[PDB]
Design a protein around this ligand. Structure first.
Ligand SMILES: *[C@@H]1O[C@H](CO)[C@@H](O)[C@H](O)[C@H]1NC(C)=O
Ligand SMILES: *[C@@H]1O[C@H](CO)[C@@H](O)[C@H](O)[C@H]1NC(C)=O
Ligand SMILES: *[C@@H]1O[C@H](CO)[C@@H](O)[C@H](O)[C@H]1NC(C)=O
Ligand SMILES: *[C@@H]1O[C@H](CO)[C@@H](O)[C@H](O)[C@H]1NC(C)=O
Ligand SMILES: *[C@@H]1O[C@H](CO)[C@@H](O)[C@H](O)[C@H]1NC(C)=O
Ligand SMILES: *[C@@H]1O[C@H](CO)[C@@H](O)[C@H](O)[C@H]1NC(C)=O
Lengths: 173, 137
């Protein structure tokens, strides 16, 4: 049996040295969309009949707060990536947690700059992985240095948040 | 042991025997998972907050961890099952969260009470019961 999973996909944008206000976000539960984010209203909302009618409405209050915290963090991170080239630039974070059939858990996050993977972190072990490329290494050094200036607690708390939500959403269905 | 804030004149002496009868702000049960995430607004620098753990199998057996000025000042007496036992402050809102995540075993099942002192009395802002069970539905 395939693992249950909760996946968040957030993206922030910058142009001409300015990180745009707000962020884009979506969430999938066991591979299906369940969450969308209204960038104008600044509200997480249900996506699909199941999320609309089965999940408690408190879901969207919690997700709104959590996405706001995550999205503003991502805006800050983009601000500190060195890139003086013109054009629209993007930073995307994919965050996932899983519960497997043996009841064990997994969790990770992955960062993409202009569509290119440059950093993955295992939220359970704290191990980081950077692709073997000069560009990705530069980006990852950029980001990880900014973060350096409760590291373990920070990463484990992200995993705890995710797992708690996954368990709650699975129960509702 | 004392909880609360000296600067706010809101200190309370913890009596674990009284916790069972306190009405919690929110209360729920997890089967096969022990993740408690308690939400504290406007925590002051000197405020002591924390989490009490009462073992399912003996209501008299109670452990405690405590947090003050963004640091753990007391660990659970047994930390071997701990995955996370620490606080963090949010950036977008003035909230401190206390995280307690542990492996679920015959020794960690029970009641986790997130504590705060208000007007010199012990409050329970959230209570989580933890039971054995399959995480995978
Ligand atoms: C703790 O609480 C119980 C129940 O109210 C009470 O009987 C006992 O005296 C208290 N212990 C102390 C040290 O105050
Ligand atoms: C925390 O303090 C701020 C500033 O004094 C206040 O606006 C807010 O209402 C307080 N939060 C709560 C929930 O008490
Ligand atoms: C809280 O911690 C900081 C160090 O991070 C220290 O400077 C400050 O004095 C502490 N506050 C109290 C009341 O202990
Ligand atoms: C429960 O714990 C108390 C306090 O340690 C102890 O006195 C008592 O014997 C225990 N009872 C059982 C049945 O384990
Ligand atoms: C709590 O446990 C951790 C890990 O063993 C240790 O580093 C820390 O000093 C402990 N804190 C206290 C106040 O006992
Ligand atoms: C308690 O759980 C442990 C695994 O954490 C197991 O090895 C042990 O046999 C259990 N003991 C009892 C009496 O349930």
């Amino acid at each position: 049996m395939e693992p249950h999973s909760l996946r968040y996909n957030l993206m922030v944008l910058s142009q001409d040295e300015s990180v745009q206000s707000g962020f884009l976000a979506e969430g999938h539960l066991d591979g299906q969309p369940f969450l969308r984010y209204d960038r104008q209203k600044r509200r997480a909302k249900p996506q699909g009949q199941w999320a609309e009618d089965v999940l408690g409405a408190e879901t969207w209050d919690t997700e709104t707060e959590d996405l706001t915290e995550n999205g503003q963090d991502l805006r800050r991170t983009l601000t500190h990536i060195k890139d003086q080239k013109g054009g629209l630039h993007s930073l995307q974070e994919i965050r996932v947690c899983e519960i497997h059939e043996d009841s064990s858990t997994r969790g990770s996050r992955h960062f993409y700059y202009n569509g290119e993977l440059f950093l993955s972190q295992n939220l359970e072990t704290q191990e980081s992985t950077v692709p073997q490329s000069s560009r990705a290494q530069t980006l990852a050094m950029n980001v990880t240095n900014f973060w350096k200036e409760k590291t373990k607690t920070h990463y484990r708390a992200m995993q705890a948040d995710c797992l708690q939500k996954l368990q709650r959403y699975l129960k509702s269905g | 042991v004392d909880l609360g804030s000296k600067s706010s004149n809101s200190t309370c002496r913890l009596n674990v025997t009284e916790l069972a009868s306190i009405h919690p702000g929110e209360t729920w049960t997890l089967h096969g998972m022990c993740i408690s995430i308690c939400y504290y607004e406007n925590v002051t620098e000197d405020e002591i907050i924390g989490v009490a753990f009462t073992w399912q199998h003996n209501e008299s057996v109670v452990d405690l961890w405590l947090y003050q000025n963004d640091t753990v000042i007391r660990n659970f007496s047994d930390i071997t099952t701990n995955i996370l036992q620490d606080g963090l402050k949010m950036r977008t809102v003035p909230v401190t969260k206390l995280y307690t995540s542990r492996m679920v075993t015959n020794l960690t099942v029970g009641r986790y009470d997130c504590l705060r002192c208000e007007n010199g009395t012990t409050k329970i802002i959230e209570r989580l019961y933890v039971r054995l069970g399959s995480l995978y539905p």
